[PDB]
Amino acid sequence: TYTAGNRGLKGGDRGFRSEGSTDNGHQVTSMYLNDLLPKLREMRASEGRPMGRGEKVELVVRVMGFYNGRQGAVRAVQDRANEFHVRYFEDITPFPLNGPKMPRGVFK
Amino acid sequence: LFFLRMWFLYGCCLRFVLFVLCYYMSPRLPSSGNRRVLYAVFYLYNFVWMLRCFFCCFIGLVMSLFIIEGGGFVDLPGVKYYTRIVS
Amino acid sequence: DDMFIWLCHTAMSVLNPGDMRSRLIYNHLRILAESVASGEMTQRTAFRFFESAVRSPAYREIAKRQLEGGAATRLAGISAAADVMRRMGLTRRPMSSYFELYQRIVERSEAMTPWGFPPLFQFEERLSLEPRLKFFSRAS
Amino acid sequence: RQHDSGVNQYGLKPTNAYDYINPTNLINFGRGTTFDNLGVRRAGRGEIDSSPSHSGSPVFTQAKLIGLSGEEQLTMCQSETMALRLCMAKAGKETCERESRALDSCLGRVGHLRRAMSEACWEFNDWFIQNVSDNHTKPFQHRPHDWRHFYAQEKLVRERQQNGHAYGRRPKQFSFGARYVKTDGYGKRPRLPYNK
Amino acid sequence: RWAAKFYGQVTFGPRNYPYPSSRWLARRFQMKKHRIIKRFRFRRYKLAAVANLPFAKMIRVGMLPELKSSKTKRGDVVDPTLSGQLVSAVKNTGEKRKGQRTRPKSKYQV
Amino acid sequence: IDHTFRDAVDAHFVGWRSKKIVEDIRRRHPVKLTIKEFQSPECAIGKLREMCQAMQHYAQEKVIYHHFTSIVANDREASITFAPALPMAKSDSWKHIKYPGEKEWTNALRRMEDACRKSGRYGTYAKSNKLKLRSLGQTSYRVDKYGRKMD
RNA sequence: UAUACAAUUAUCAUAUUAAAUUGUUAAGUGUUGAUUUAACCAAUAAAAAUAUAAAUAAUUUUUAUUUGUUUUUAAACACCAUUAGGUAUAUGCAAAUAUAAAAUUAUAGUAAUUAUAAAUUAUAUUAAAAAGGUAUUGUUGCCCACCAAUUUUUAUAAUAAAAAUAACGUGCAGUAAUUAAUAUAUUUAUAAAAAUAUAUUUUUUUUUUUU
Ligand SMILES: [Mg+2]
Ligand SMILES: [Mg+2]
Ligand SMILES: [Mg+2]
Ligand SMILES: [Mg+2]
Ligand SMILES: [Mg+2]
Ligand SMILES: [Mg+2]
Ligand SMILES: [Mg+2]
Ligand SMILES: [Mg+2]
Ligand SMILES: [Mg+2]
Ligand SMILES: [Mg+2]
Ligand SMILES: [Mg+2]
Ligand SMILES: [Mg+2]
Ligand SMILES: [Mg+2]
Ligand SMILES: [Mg+2]
Ligand SMILES: [Mg+2]
Fold first, then answer.
1. Half-sphere exposure for F7 (CA within 13 Å, toward CB)
2. How far apart are CA C47 and CA C26, in angstroms?
3. What secondary structure letter does DSSP report for A104?
4. Do chains F and B touch, with touching meaning 3 or more CB–CB pairs less than 8 Å apart?
5. Are D5 and C124 in contact (CB under 8 A)?
6. DSSP SS3 for F66
7. Taking a C-beta distance cutoff of 8 angstroms, is the pair F34, F3 a contact?
8. Where do the H-state alpha helices sit in chain D?
9. Among F18, F25, F23, F76, which residue's Cα sits nearest to residue F49?
10. C-alpha dihedral over D43, D48, D49, D50, to 10 degrees?
């Protein structure tokens, strides 16, 4: 998992306010896809699926969270459209009907 | 009317008391000065009570017993009884 | 001058004020007008006097023989209201009465919900509207 | 006479007994105050205390209504700007000023449209002040405590169900999984408060 | 409940004041309640009411010679058997035995 | 952790604040006692001495170990610093509660006297001659509002 | 010293014609790692969804019954403490605002009152416009507890309680007031008070009639 704190990009820096920002999500996703292609071609070469040329990876983008870092993330997928082909965009975002207590904030 | 201030008159208008001490006490602000308070004694049903009252009176040649009357309020908190004459 | 405002209300602000040519209702209006001038009455009081004045027995049920929704025609009202200001000596120059009473109505014709009024602001009361927003006022 | 009946020579004319003990109330309602401005408690426009009120809470969103200057604001031309953007992004060999002409036409109209909407909205402010606004004279309806009586009516009901006993009482919150962590003999779901 | 909800009259405002208490008044009385409760805690008060005894009259166990906090004041005179039993009660209240229901503990309870 | 307090201070304050600071030493924290507000240098050390001689009195009975670190005797600051013992191996190897004693006091005293005399300013503030209204309650004689006798 | 409440609408502790109680569901492994936080430290992470009708109205339940404290962590979150843990939510006990009352305080002798709400108080992104005061020429405004003396009443709990009070020393609790306050509950403690669990505005508002 390539993470905004895993890639540098986070600490000892500008601030927390901008930590979960759009452009960080973009940096992370675009850094991840770059490293994702070759390993995909290797995992396929292992079972004998060459995917030599003129092929796209059929992708399902599952998105969680309703936070700023989402927007930018998907953008870094869209500029890879010549490599990756998105069939389905479905977001899995947990909804709390009720459940165990969340951590107590300041006021309540 | 405040009926609990009269506790030591015991249903009487005036009292007879004996002099013991005379000390001074400072009134509630914004009134400054020294209020003279006489500490007196009297007996009822063979009980000896110490009464504490405001000395407004005129002392002449040395004398012992006073006549106590109740008033309205005064500068000094806690002192209900006043002095009429000294005998 | 507030007189013209009052008369505008009696003309346009009242559904079915009977037949306003008849000497009875006409005299009601005349007297009340002369009582708004010379300050003998509040405008509000004279208006509530006008609309509560005695007209004719079973008034509504005679009104069902003329009107559908109880809104009469406004010509009799304006002709009477000009007539009263002329016969009373209200203005030095005769025409001014009619002109002003007419003009103030024509300007209000363009306004949203023109012939209804909030009861508090309609007449003299403790709290008032600013002179621009007053209703039949010259400053609108 | 020459001015309002609710305002005499020295200020607002003091009717209730509150005015005679507190006659600062007659001459000062705030920093938007002038002398002609007494008895008309709302002050001019664009001015301090000029805002009209609706059931007591002032109307500060007017532009947001007609969709001038809001985040939700109405947009006149979209198809044009998108069309032109598409043109710019596609290729550089052919340049289309046809699109930029349709667009600048669109804008040229938009100006007058907007001035019209603004004017109509100021007329709305005037009308709203005349025929609707109470001039900050009635109690707020917009926060839950103002509706306390309503909630009371509901508490009362849950009390009469409980044999007219526990007012304002609610069921004890149990646990995330109270039902399946408890043994036979203990209450596994939260009961009515009277039932405890 | 046994103890007092309030101390003094906490709802004194003018009639039709649309709350039980004002902020000011409730703060005053919160102060007085605070002082009393703090006194109870630090002096280590203990009361008891025993079955088959007059109930309104409560034996004050915090004044008992064994459990007395002061080294000076004469505590109280309570029956030898009964006082032994009270001492045992206070002592075996302290700690949580498993299977028993958890009950709030404090420094001042000992 | 730094504790700053004034020059004029009650016995009371000395007591509870002493217990506080020692309880803070017990947890291994940094402890510095500072006077940045004082009438005279002599007074300032009067109080530093008071607080310290209360501190060892209390901390020896509960037996928590700390060594005296730093005395800074200065123009604007009169201060002492204590360091706790790190472990129970540190408490058993070095078992000491180590304080300054008359020599270190009096020496950094004269050093403060000279340091303050050199700058020409002997304290941040000094007491004022103002007498606030004071009731004494019961008296044997006439007394003016400030609490003084009548000649 | 004696010398005329209300009975049409009054907020703190004397309830009372009421339909509930019982339901076994969910969730869990691939692999080499900077998650959460304003900031520290411990260190597998996923999760627990269904019930209406019906019960008749009043006249002797008031020593009866009843008002959010609850076995099981070998199950978590949460909270409390800090690398060594505690706790983790209605089978014992537990009457209690929803008002029947006669000026404030005070265990029902202490001080002489108290409480209270709309006047006034310059900056919250409209084509400049909405805002609070325990102060009263008003924040350099007021106030809060402990910490000494004394005064006075008594139902004497570490060091009695309560009331008057004008020192000294800590602070800075309160006036949406430097983590909003208020009430109950439980814990904590130099001192105002602070932490958590519920209710709540005597706190300032931000507003999707199937997209
Ligand atoms: Mg009597
Ligand atoms: Mg007097
Ligand atoms: Mg204003
Ligand atoms: Mg409490
Ligand atoms: Mg009752
Ligand atoms: Mg348990
Ligand atoms: Mg005494
Ligand atoms: Mg006392
Ligand atoms: Mg504060
Ligand atoms: Mg606070
Ligand atoms: Mg605060
Ligand atoms: Mg509170
Ligand atoms: Mg504290
Ligand atoms: Mg509290
Ligand atoms: Mg709180």
1. 19
2. 14
3. P
4. yes
5. yes
6. strand
7. yes
8. 17-21, 63-66, 79-90, 98-131, 148-160, 178-181
9. F18
10. 60
Q: How far apart are CA C47 and CA C2, in angstroms?
A: 13
Chain D within 8 Å of C119 (Cβ-Cβ)? no
Q: What residue type is C6 in one-letter code?
A: W
Q: Do chains D and C touch (3 or more CB pairs under 8 A)?
A: yes
- Distance set, CA C71 to CA C16, C29, C116 (Å): 5, 19, 13
Q: CB-side exposure of E101: number of CA atoms within 13 Å?
A: 1
Specify the residue for token string 């995992």.
Answer: A43
Q: Which nucleotide is closest to D56, CA to C1'?
A: G130
Position F21: which residue type?
Answer: I
Q: Are F75 and F115 in contact (CB under 8 A)?
A: yes
Residue E100 DSSP SS3:
strand
- Using the CB atoms, write b or e for C74-104: b if 16+ within 10 Å: eebbbebbbbbbeeeebbeeeeebbebbbeb
Q: Which residue has the tokens 């299977």?
A: E99
Look at the block and give the residue holding tokens 């008033």.
B71
The closest alpha carbon to D39, from A25, E93, C124, E45, belongs to C124
Look up residue E61 and give its DSSP letter. G
Q: Which nucleotide is nearest to E99 (CA to C1')?
A: G71
Ligand 10 centre to CA of F6 (Å) is 26
CB-based contacts of F67, cutoff 8 Å, min separation 6: F82, F83, F85, F94, F96, F97, F98
Q: What angle do CA C53, C54, C56 make, to 5 degrees?
A: 140
Q: Are D117 and D64 in contact (CB under 8 A)?
A: no
Which residue from C48, C13, C16, C27 is spatially nearest to C124, judged by alpha carbons? Answer: C48
Strands (E), C47-116: none
| Contact assessment for residue B62 and residue B6, using Cβ atoms and an 8 Å cutoff | no
Give long-range contacts, CB 8 A cutoff, 24+ apart: D163-168. D163/D194, D165/D194, D166/D193, D166/D194
D127 in contact with chain C, both atoms CB, cutoff 8 A: yes
**Could you tell me the two tokens for E16?**
């039709």
Question: Strand G: which nucleotides have any atom within 7 A of a protein Cβ?
Answer: 1-2, 10-13, 15-26, 33-36, 38-39, 47-49, 66-73, 75-79, 87-92, 94-99, 103-107, 109-112, 114-122, 126-131, 134, 144-153, 156-171, 174-175, 179-193, 196-207
CA–C1' gap, E39 and G158, in angstroms: 9
Chain D contact for A96 (CB, 8 A cutoff): no
| CB-CB contact of D160 with D192 (8 Å) | no
Method: cryo-EM
Cβ–Cβ below 8 Å for C126 and D39? yes
CA distances from F133 to B32, C42, F130 (A): 9, 64, 10
Q: Assign 3-class secondary structure to chain B.
A: CCCCCCCCCCCCCEEEEEEEEEEEECCCCCCCCCEEEEEEEEEECCEEEEEEEECCCCCCCCCCEEEEEECCCCCCCCCCEEEEEEC
Residue A25: how many other CB atoms lie within 10 Å = 21
Spatial CB neighbours of F60, under 8 Å, sequence gap ≥ 6: F97
C-beta of residue C132 within 8 angstroms of C-beta of residue C124: no
Nearest Cα neighbor of C102 from C1, C10, C4, C3 is C4
Could you tell me which of F136, F134, F137 has the C-alpha nearest to residue F145? F134
Residue B51 CB neighbours (<10 A)? 20
Rounded CA-CA distance D5/D12 in Å is 9
Alpha-carbon torsion (B61, B62, B67, B73), positive or negative: positive
- Chain A nearest CA to D190, separation (Å): 15
